[PDB]
Amino acid sequence: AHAFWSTQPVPQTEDETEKIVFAGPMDEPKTVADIPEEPYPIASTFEWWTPNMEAADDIHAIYELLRDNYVEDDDSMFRFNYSEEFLQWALCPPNYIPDWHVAVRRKADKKLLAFIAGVPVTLRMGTPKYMKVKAQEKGEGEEAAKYDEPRHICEINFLCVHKQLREKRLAPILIKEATRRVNRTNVWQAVYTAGVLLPTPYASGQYFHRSLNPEKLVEIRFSGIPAQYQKFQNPMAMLKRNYQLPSAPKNSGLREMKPSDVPQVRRILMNYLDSFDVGPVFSDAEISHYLLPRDGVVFTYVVENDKKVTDFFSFYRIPSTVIGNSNYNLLNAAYVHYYAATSIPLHQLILDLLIVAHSRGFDVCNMVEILDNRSFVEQLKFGAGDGHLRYYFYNWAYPKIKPSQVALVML
Numbered sequence: 001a002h003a004f005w006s007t008q009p010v011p012q013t014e015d016e017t018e019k020i021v022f023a024g025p026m027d028e029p030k031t032v033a034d035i036p037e038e039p040y041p042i043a044s045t046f047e048w049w050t051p052n053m054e055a056a057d058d059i060h061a062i063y064e065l066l067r068d069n070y071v072e073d074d075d076s077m078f079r080f081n082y083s084e085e086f087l088q089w090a091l092c093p094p095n096y097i098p099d100w101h102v103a104v105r106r107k108a109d110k111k112l113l114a115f116i117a118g119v120p121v122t123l124r125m126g127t128p129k130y131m132k133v134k135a136q137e138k139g140e141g142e143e144a145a146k147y148d149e150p151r152h153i154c155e156i157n158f159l160c161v162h163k164q165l166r167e168k169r170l171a172p173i174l175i176k177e178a179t180r181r182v183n184r185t186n187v188w189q190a191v192y193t194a195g196v197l198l199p200t201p202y203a204s205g206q207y208f209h210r211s212l213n214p215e216k217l218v219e220i221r222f223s224g225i226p227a228q229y230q231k232f233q234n235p236m237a238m239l240k241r242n243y244q245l246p247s248a249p250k251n252s253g254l255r256e257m258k259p260s261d262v263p264q265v266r267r268i269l270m271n272y273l274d275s276f277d278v279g280p281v282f283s284d285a286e287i288s289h290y291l292l293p294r295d296g297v298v299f300t301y302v303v304e305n306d307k308k309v310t311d312f313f314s315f316y317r318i319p320s321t322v323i324g325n326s327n328y329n330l331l332n333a334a335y336v337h338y339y340a341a342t343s344i345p346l347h348q349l350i351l352d353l354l355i356v357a358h359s360r361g362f363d364v365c366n367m368v369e370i371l372d373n374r375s376f377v378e379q380l381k382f383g384a385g386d387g388h389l390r391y392y393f394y395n396w397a398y399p400k401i402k403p404s405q406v407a408l409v410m411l
């Protein structure tokens with residue numbers, strides 16, 4: 001049972017979700033005027049705090065909270081360690097709403113205890129292609145297309161409650177206060193991802209990873225293995241050889257993205273993302289914010305042929321604290337972000353991703369099987385991890401879709 005999620009406008013079972021045939025809201029239409037003006041009540045020892053995510057000291061406070069208390073893998077080998085610079089980038093895109101960055105502190109000594117953040121995203125979230133075919137057969141095309149226009153909604157991330165305050169029902173209070181602040185802006189849907197199963201995802205995909213620095217990963221994952229390399233020797237030689245990469249990119253035309261590339265990147269990205277059921281719509285300002293390179297945060301390269309951008313790829317950096325080990329405190333991971341190929345096979349493009357990442361000192365490249373990420377898993381030697389990413393809407397009925405129909409990369 002679900003004392004909190006059972007009270008919310010989300011599909012309550014897989015079975016409920018199996019039945020959904022059209023996109024659209026779950027709740028009663030409401031108006032901003034219906035929504036409480038004052039913050040949701042919390043106990044007298046706590047206070048609401050709106051950190052300024054553009055202010056270095058407030059960023060630092062959130063940073064420490066997440067560093068010590070945010071997402072761990074199932075075996076508690078790793079905990080994300082998002083950088084300060086990354087936090088500022090992720091939480092302050094163009095037209096961001098400072099009121100959507102919500103924290104709780106202890107009133108008496110200002111100890112930071114909890115956080116959640118929303119940012120605006122414009123998303124296509126109309127009825128998916130396969131359900132529209134069904135609707136057309138049945139003479140229900142108009143009902144299936146009602147919510148096809150891109151919608152200005154909230155993307156929620158970075159929900160975190162300090163370890164000392166877990167399982168005290170603080171997360172539901174954070175979620176209700178975030179909901180209220182978003183609703184007060186006349187927004188009624190949100191999109192969110194999690195590695196846990198909650199009621200009820202519209203899509204779910206595995207994580208995949210690709211070793212860039214085998215010597216370091218084997219030190220971390222266990223002692224003297226892994227299983228299928230057991231017999232040789234040398235298993236370490238075999239492993240290094242398996243994951244080895246060119247030291248320079250192969251694609252002539254490859255260079256870092258520059259601001260003048262923004263219009264062309266937007267055009268090729270938007271044409272590609274259009275082929276997916278759920279996916280963002282980015283303005284030029286959003287393309288510039290999410291894709292222009294930023295030291296230690298986001299890395300974006302374009303293939304230019306004849307002064308025209310024909311392909312591009314991006315990845316972003318999330319270090320993880322290595323919780324158990326000693327030789328190594330941190331794992332430097334690259335995550336596949338957006339890309340688009342029009343002149344070369346996607347595997348040839350992503351190979352250059354791997355080369356640049358390796359060249360820049362990343363230990364591993366990680367991704368979810370969204371977009372066309374499955375198309376290069378085998379040849380580029382990605383292996384499935386133990387993680388899954390589950391995609392959810394708040395207040396939006398949505399038919400189940402494959403993760404290959406999802407084009408929103410959540411940081």
Ligand SMILES: CCCCCCCCCCCCCC(=O)SCCNC(=O)CCNC(=O)[C@H](O)C(C)(C)COP(=O)(O)OP(=O)(O)OC[C@H]1O[C@@H](n2cnc3c(N)ncnc32)[C@H](O)[C@@H]1OP(=O)(O)O
Nearest residue numbers: 002003004005158159160161166167168169170171188190
């Ligand atoms: C229109 C605008 C809408 C905006 C809001 C839309 C909703 C956004 C939703 C948030 C999207 C966030 C996206 C991300 O950032 S996903 C990443 C979440 N963060 C972490 O995993 C960090 C480490 N863990 C923690 O900090 C905590 O354990 C959290 C905070 C996760 C739970 O704290 P705690 O362990 O101390 O528990 P509690 O007693 O306070 O509360 C227990 C209740 O919380 C439900 N629970 C557990 N995990 C999650 C989860 N990941 N999303 C939603 N709900 C979750 C659980 O089913 C139970 O409810 P019910 O089963 O009893 O019913």
Ligand SMILES: COC(=O)c1ccc(N2CCCCCC2)c(NS(=O)(=O)c2ccc(CCCCC3CCN(C)CC3)cc2)c1
Nearest residue numbers: 071072073078079080193195207209320385386387410411
């Ligand atoms: C916290 O976990 C780590 O820091 C982490 C670090 C390293 C990982 N590997 C596993 C294989 C060898 C070592 C390198 C790559 C994984 N693996 S795994 O299979 O890829 C996974 C990835 C991610 C998770 C977390 C669940 C997703 C959390 C959401 C992520 C997106 N938001 C926007 C919301 C939370 C769990 C396992 C994990």
